[PDB]
mmCIF file with all atom_site columns, C-alpha atoms in Angstrom:
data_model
loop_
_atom_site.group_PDB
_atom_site.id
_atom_site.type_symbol
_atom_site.label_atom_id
_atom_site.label_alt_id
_atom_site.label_comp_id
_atom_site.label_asym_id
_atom_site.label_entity_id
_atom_site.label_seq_id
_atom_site.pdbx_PDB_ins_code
_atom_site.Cartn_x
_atom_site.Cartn_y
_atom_site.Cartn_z
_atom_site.occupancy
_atom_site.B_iso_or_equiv
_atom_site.pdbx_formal_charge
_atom_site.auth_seq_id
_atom_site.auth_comp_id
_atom_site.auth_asym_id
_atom_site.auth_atom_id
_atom_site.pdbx_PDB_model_num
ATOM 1   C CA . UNK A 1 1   ? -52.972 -5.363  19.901 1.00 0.00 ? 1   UNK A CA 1
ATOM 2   C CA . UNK A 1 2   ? -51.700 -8.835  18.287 1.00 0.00 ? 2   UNK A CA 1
ATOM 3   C CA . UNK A 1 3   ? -51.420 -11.987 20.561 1.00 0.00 ? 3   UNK A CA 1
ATOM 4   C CA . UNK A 1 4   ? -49.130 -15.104 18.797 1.00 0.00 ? 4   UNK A CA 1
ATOM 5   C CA . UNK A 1 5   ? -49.080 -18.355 20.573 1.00 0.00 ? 5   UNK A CA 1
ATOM 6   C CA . UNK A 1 6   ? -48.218 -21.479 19.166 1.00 0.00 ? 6   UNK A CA 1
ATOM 7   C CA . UNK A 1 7   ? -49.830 -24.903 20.289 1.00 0.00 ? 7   UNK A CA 1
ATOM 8   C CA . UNK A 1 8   ? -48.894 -28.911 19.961 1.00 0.00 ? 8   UNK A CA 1
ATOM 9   C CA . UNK A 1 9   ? -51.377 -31.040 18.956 1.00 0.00 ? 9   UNK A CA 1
ATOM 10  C CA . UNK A 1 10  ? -49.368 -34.382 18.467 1.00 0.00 ? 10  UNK A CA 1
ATOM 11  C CA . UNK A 1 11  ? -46.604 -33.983 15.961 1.00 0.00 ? 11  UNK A CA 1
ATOM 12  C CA . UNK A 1 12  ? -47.788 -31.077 14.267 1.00 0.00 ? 12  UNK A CA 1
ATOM 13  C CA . UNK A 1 13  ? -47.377 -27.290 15.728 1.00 0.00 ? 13  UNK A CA 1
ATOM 14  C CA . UNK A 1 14  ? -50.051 -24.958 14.941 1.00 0.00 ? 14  UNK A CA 1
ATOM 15  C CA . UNK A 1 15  ? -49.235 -21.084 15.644 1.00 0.00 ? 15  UNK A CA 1
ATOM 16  C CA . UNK A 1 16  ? -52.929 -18.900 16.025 1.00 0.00 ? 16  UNK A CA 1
ATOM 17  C CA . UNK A 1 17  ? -52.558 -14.926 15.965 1.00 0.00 ? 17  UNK A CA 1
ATOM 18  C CA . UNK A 1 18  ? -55.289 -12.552 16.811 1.00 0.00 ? 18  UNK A CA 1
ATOM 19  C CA . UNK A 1 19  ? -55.730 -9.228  16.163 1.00 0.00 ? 19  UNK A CA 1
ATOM 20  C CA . UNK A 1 20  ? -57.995 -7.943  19.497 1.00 0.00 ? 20  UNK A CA 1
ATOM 21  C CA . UNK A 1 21  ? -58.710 -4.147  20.924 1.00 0.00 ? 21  UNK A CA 1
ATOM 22  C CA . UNK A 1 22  ? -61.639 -4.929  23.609 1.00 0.00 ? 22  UNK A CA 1
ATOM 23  C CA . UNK A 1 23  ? -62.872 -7.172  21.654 1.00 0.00 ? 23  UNK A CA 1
ATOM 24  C CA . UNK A 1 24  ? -61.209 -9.619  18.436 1.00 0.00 ? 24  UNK A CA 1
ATOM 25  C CA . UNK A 1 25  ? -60.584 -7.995  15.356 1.00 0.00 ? 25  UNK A CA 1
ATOM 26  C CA . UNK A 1 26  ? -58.794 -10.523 13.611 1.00 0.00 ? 26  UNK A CA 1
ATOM 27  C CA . UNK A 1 27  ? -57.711 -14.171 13.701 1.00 0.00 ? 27  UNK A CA 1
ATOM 28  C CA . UNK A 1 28  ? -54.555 -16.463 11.587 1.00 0.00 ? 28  UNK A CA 1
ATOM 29  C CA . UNK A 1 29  ? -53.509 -19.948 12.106 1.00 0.00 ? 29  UNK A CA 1
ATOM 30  C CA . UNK A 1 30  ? -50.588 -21.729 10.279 1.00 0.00 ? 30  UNK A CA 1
ATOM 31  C CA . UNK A 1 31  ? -48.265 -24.121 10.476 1.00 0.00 ? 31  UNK A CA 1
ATOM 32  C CA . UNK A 1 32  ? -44.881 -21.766 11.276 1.00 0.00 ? 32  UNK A CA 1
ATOM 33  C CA . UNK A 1 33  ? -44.844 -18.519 12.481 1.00 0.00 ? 33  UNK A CA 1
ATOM 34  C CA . UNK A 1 34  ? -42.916 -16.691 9.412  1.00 0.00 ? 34  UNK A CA 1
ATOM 35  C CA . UNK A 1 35  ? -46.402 -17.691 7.151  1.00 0.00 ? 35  UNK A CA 1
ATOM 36  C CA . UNK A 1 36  ? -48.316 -16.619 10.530 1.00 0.00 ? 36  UNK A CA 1
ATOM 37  C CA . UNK A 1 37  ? -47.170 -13.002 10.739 1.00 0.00 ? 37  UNK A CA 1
ATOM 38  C CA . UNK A 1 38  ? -47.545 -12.843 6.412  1.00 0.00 ? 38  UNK A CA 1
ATOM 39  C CA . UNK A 1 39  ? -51.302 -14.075 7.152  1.00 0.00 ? 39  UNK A CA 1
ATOM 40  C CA . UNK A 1 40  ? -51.234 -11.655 10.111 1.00 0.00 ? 40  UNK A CA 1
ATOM 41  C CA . UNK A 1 41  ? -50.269 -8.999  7.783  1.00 0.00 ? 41  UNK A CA 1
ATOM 42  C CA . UNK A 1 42  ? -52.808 -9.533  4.917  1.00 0.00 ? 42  UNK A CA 1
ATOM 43  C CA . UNK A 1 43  ? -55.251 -9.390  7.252  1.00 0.00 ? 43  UNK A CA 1
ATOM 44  C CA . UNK A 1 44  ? -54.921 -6.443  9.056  1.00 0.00 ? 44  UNK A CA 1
ATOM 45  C CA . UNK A 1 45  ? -54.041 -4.942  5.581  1.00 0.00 ? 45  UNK A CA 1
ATOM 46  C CA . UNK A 1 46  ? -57.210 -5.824  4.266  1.00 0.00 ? 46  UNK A CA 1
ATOM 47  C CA . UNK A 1 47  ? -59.358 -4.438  7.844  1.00 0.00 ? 47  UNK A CA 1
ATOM 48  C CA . UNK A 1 48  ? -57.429 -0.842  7.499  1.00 0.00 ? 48  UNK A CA 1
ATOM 49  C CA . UNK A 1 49  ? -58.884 -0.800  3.545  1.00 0.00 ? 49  UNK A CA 1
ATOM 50  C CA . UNK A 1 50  ? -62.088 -0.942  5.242  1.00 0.00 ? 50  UNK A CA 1
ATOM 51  C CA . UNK A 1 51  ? -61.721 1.701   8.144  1.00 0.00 ? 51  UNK A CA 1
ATOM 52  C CA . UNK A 1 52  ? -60.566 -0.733  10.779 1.00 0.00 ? 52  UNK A CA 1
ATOM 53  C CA . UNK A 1 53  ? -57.981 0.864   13.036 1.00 0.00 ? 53  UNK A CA 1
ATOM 54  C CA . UNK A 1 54  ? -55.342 -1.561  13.922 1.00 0.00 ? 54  UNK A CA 1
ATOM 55  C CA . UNK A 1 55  ? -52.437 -2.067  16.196 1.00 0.00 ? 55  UNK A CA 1
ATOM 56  C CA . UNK A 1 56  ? -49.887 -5.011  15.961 1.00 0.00 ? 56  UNK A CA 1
ATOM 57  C CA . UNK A 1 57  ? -48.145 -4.275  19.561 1.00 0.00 ? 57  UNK A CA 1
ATOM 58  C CA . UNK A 1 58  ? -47.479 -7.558  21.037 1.00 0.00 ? 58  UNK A CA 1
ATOM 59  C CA . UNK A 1 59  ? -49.761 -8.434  24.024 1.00 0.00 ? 59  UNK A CA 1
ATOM 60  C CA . UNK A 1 60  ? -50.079 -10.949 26.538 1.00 0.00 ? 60  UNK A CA 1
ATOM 61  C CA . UNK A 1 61  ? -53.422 -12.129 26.170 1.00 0.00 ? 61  UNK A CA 1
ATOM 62  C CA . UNK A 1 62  ? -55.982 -15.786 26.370 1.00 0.00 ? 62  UNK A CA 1
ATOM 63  C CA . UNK A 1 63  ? -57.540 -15.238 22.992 1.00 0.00 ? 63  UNK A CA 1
ATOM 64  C CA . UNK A 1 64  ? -55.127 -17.709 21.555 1.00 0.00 ? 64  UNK A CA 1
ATOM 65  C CA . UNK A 1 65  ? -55.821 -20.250 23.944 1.00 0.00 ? 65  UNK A CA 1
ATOM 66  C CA . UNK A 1 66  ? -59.286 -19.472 23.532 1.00 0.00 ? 66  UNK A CA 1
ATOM 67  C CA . UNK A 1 67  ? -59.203 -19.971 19.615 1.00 0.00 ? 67  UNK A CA 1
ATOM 68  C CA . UNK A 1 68  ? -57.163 -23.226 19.999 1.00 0.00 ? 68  UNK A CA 1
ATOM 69  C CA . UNK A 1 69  ? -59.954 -24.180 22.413 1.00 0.00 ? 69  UNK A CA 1
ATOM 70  C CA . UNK A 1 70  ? -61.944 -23.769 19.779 1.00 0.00 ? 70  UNK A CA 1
ATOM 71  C CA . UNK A 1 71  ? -59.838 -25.867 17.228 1.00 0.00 ? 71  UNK A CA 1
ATOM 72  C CA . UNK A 1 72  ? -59.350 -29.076 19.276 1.00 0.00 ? 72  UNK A CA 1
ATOM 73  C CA . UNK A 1 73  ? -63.666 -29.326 20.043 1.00 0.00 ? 73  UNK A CA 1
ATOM 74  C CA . UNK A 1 74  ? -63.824 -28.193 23.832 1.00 0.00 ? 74  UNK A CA 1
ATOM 75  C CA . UNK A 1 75  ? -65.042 -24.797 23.329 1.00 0.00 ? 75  UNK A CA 1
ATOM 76  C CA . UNK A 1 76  ? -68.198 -24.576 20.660 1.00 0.00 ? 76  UNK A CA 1
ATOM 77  C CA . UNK A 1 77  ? -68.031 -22.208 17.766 1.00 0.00 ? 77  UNK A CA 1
ATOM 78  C CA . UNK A 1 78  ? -71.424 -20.908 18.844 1.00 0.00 ? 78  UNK A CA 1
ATOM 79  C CA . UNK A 1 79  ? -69.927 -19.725 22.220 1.00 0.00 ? 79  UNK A CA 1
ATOM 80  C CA . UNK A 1 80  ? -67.028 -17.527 20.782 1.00 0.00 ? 80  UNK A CA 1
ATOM 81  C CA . UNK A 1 81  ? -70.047 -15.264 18.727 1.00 0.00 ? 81  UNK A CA 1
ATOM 82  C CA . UNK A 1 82  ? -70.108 -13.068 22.093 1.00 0.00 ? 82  UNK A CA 1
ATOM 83  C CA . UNK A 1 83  ? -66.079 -12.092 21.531 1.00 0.00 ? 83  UNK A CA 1
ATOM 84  C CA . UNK A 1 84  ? -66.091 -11.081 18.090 1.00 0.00 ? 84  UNK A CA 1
ATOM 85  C CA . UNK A 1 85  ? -66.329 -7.334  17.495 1.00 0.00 ? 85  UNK A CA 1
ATOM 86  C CA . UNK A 1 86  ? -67.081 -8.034  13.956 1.00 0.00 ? 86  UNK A CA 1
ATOM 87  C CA . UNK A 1 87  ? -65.103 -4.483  12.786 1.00 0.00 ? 87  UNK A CA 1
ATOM 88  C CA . UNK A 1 88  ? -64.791 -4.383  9.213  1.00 0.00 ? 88  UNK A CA 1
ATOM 89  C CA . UNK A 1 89  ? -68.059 -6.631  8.441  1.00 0.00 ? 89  UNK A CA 1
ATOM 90  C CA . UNK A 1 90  ? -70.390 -6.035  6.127  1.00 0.00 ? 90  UNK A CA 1
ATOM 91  C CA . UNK A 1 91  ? -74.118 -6.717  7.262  1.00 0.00 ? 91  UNK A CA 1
ATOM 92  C CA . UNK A 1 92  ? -74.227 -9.552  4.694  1.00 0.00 ? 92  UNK A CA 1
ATOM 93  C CA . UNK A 1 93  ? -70.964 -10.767 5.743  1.00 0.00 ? 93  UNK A CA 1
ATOM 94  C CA . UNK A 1 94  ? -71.898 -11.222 9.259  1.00 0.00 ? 94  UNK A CA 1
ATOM 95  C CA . UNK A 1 95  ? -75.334 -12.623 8.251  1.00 0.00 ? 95  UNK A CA 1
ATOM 96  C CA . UNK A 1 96  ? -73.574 -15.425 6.726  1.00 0.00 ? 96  UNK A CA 1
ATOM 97  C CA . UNK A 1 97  ? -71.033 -15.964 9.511  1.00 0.00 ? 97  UNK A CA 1
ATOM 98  C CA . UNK A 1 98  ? -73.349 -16.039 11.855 1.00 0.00 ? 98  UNK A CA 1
ATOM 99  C CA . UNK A 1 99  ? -75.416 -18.568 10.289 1.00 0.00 ? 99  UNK A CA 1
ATOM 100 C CA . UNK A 1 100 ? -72.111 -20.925 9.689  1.00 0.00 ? 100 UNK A CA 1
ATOM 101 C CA . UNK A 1 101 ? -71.344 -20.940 12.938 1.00 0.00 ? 101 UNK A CA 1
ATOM 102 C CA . UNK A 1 102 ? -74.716 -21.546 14.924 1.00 0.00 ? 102 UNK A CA 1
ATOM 103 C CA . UNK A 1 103 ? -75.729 -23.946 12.107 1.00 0.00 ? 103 UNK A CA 1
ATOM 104 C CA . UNK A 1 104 ? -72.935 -26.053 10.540 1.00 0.00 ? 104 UNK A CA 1
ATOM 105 C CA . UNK A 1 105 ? -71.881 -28.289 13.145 1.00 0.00 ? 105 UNK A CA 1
ATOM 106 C CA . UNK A 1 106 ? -68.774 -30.091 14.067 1.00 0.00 ? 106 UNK A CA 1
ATOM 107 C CA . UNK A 1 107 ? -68.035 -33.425 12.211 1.00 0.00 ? 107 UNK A CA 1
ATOM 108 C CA . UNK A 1 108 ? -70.347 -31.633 8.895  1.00 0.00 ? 108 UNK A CA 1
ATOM 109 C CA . UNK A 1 109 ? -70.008 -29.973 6.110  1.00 0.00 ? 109 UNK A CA 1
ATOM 110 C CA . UNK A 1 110 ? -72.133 -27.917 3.901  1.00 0.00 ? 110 UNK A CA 1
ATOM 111 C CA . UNK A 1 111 ? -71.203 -27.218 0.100  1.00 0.00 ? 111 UNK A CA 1
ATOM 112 C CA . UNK A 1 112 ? -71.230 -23.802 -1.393 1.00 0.00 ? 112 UNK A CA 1
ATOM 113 C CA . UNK A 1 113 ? -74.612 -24.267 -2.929 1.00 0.00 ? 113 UNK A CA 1
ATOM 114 C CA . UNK A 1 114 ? -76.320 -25.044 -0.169 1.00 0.00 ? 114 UNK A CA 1
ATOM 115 C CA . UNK A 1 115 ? -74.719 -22.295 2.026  1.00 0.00 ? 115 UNK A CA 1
ATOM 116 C CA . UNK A 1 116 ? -76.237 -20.273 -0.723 1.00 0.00 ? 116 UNK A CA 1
ATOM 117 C CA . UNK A 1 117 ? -79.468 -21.873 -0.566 1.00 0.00 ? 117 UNK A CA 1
ATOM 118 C CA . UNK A 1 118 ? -80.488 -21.591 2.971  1.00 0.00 ? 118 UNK A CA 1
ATOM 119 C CA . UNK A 1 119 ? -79.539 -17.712 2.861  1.00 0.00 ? 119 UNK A CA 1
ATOM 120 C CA . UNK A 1 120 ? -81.523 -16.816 -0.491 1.00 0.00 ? 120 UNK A CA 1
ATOM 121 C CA . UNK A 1 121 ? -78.080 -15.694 -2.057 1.00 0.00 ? 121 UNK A CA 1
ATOM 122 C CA . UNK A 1 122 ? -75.791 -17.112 -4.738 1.00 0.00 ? 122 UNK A CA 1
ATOM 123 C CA . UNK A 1 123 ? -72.644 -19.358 -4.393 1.00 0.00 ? 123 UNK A CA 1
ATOM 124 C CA . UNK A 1 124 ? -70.664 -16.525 -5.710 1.00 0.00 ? 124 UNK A CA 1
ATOM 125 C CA . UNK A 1 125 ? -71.519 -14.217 -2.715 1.00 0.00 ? 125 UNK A CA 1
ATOM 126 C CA . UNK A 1 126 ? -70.982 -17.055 0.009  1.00 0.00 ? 126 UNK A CA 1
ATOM 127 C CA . UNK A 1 127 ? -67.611 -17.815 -1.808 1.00 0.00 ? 127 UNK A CA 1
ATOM 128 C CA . UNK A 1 128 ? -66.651 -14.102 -1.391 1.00 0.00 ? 128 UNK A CA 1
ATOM 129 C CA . UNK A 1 129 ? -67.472 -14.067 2.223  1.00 0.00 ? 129 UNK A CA 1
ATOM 130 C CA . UNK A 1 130 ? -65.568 -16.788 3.161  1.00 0.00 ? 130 UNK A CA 1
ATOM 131 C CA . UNK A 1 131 ? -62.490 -15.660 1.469  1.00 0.00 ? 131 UNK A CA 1
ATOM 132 C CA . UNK A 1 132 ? -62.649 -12.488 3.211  1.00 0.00 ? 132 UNK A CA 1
ATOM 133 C CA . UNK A 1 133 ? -63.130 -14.097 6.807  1.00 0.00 ? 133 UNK A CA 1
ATOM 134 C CA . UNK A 1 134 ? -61.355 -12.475 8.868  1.00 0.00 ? 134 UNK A CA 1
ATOM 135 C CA . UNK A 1 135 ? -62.341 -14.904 12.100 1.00 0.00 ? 135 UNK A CA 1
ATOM 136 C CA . UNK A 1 136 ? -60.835 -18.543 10.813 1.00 0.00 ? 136 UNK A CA 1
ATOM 137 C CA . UNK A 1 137 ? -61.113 -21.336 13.168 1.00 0.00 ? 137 UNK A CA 1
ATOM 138 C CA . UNK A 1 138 ? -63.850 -20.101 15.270 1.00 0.00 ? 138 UNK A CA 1
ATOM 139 C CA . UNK A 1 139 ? -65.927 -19.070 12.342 1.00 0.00 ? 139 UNK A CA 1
ATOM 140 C CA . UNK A 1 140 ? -65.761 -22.546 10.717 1.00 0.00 ? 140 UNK A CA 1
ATOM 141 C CA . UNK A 1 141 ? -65.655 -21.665 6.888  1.00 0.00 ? 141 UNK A CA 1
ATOM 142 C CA . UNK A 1 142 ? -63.545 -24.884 6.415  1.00 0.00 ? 142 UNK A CA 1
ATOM 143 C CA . UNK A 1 143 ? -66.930 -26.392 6.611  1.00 0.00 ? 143 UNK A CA 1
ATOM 144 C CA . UNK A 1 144 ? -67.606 -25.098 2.985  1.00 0.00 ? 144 UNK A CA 1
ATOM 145 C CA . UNK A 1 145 ? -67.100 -27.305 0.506  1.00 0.00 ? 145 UNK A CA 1
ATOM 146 C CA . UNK A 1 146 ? -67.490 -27.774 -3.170 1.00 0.00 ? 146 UNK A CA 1
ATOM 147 C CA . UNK A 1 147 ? -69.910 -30.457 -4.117 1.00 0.00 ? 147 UNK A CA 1
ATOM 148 C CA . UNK A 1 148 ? -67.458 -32.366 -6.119 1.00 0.00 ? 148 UNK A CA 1
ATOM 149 C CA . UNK A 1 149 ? -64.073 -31.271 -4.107 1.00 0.00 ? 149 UNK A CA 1
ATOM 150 C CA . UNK A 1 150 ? -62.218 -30.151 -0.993 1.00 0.00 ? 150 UNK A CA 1
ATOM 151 C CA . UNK A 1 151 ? -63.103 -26.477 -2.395 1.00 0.00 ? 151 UNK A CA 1
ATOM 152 C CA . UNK A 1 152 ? -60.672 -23.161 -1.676 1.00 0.00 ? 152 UNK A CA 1
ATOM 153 C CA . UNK A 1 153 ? -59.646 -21.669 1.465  1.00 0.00 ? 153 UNK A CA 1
ATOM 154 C CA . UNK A 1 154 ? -58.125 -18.581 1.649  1.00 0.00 ? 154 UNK A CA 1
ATOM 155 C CA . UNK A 1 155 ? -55.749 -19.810 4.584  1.00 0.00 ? 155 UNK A CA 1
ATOM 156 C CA . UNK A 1 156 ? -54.208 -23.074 2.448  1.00 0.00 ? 156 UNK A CA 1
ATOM 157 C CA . UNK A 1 157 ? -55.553 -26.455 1.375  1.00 0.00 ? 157 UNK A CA 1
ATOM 158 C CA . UNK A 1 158 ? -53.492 -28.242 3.894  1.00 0.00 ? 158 UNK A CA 1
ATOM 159 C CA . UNK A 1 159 ? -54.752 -26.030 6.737  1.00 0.00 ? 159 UNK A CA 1
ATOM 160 C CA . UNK A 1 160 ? -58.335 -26.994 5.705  1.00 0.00 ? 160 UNK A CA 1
ATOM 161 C CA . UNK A 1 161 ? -57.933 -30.682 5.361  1.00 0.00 ? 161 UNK A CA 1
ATOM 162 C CA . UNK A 1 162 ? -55.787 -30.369 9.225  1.00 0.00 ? 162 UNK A CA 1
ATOM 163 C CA . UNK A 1 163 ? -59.511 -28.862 10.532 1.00 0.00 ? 163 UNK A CA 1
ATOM 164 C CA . UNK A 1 164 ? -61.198 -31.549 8.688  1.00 0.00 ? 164 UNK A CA 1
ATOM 165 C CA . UNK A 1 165 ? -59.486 -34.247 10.034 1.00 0.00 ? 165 UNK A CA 1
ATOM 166 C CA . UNK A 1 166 ? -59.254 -32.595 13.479 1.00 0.00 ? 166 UNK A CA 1
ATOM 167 C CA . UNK A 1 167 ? -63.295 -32.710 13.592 1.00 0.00 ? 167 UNK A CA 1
ATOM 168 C CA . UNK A 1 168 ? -63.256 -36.375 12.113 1.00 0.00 ? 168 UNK A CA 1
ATOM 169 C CA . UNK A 1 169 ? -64.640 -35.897 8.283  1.00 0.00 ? 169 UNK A CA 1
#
């Protein structure tokens, strides 16, 4: 089932998707909904290539809310662990989400290197995890930065400097 709700925070409009059966599959954040459902797309795209069965009926649901929660600081990342199904992981994958999230706190950031550091693994690994996130927002990968840069993010540069700034770095 899909859920799309879209949220004010001041002047700006931020429109979260997620992709939930029981539990959340999937989440996508952007700034209109046209580049929402495109994100929504790619995503679920890329969970079927890895056995995932998905559904993109349109459901009432407070997993939006829940994310956005999330995005503005009232709900911790930690605390949103226990909703993820974490479908279409890979045990590494999760190992370093998990880690992210209970370690990398609001108002920090950690550069690739490090990330890589702390889990015995290379920056090249880390970097493929985080582009293949499918839990933005709640699993903060826009904590990840290069050490001499903003770094990628598979969602858009402008999307990762809004969480920055939203979390005051």
């Amino acid at each position: 089932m899909l859920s799309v709700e879209k949220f004010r925070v001041g002047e700006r409009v931020v429109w979260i998707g997620v992709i939930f059966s029981g539990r959340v599959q999937g989440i996508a954040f952007a700034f209109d909904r046209g580049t929402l459902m495109k994100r929504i797309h790619d995503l679920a795209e890329h969970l079927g290539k890895r056995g995932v069965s998905i559904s993109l009926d349109v459901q009432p649901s407070d997993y939006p809310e829940k994310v956005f929660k999330v995005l503005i600081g009232e709900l911790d990342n930690a605390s949103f662990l226990r909703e993820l199904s974490f479908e279409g992981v890979t045990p590494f994958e999760k190992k370093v989400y998990e880690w992210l999230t209970k370690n990398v706190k609001r108002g920090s950031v950690i550069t690739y290197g490090d990330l890589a550091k702390a889990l015995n693994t290379s920056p090249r690994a880390v970097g493929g995890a985080m582009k293949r996130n499918p839990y933005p927002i709640v699993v903060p990968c826009h904590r990840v930065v290069a050490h001499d840069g903003i770094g990628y993010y598979s969602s858009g540069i402008e999307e990762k400097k809004f969480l920055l700034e939203i979390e005051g770095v």
